[PDB]
């Protein structure tokens, strides 16, 4: 069981573990696209908000592979047209930089990024 986030990293993982939970990403609404667009949106406040002005940090690096990289990769469907806009992957790049801005800066990223085509 939890609580309420109190911490600026309970809200953190609250909102990447919220992410995760989306069962099928992209979606046009194929569904669903316009809810997941908004997490990444509240995703990216929060990572700005997290400037552990007095709140935490740990879950940037597990953001990295299971968002970030993750959505570059399908991003690339021209396909039929998923739904899926230009400003879908400048949302992603922004988030990257969100990740980046935060203490942070290694050969983890090197590592996790590699792995995906990127």
């Known amino acids: 069981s939890v609580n309420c986030l109190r911490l600026g990293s309970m ?16 979606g046009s609404v194929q569904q669903l696209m316009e809810k997941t ?3 990444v949106f509240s995703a990216f406040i929060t990572v700005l908000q997290m400037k552990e002005m007095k709140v935490s940090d740990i879950p940037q690096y597990s953001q990295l592979v299971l968002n970030v990289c993750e959505t570059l990769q399908e991003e690339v469907i021209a396909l ?9 992957c400048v949302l992603g790049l922004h988030l990257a930089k969100e990740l980046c801005e935060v203490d942070e800066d290694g050969d983890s990223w090197l590592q996790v990024t590699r792995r995906l085509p990127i």
């Open 37 to 39: 667009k908004a997490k």
């Open 80 to 88: 039929f047209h998923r739904d899926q806009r230009d400003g879908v």
């Open 11 to 26: 809200k953190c993982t609250l909102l990447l573990i919220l992410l995760r939970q989306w069962k099928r990403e992209l």
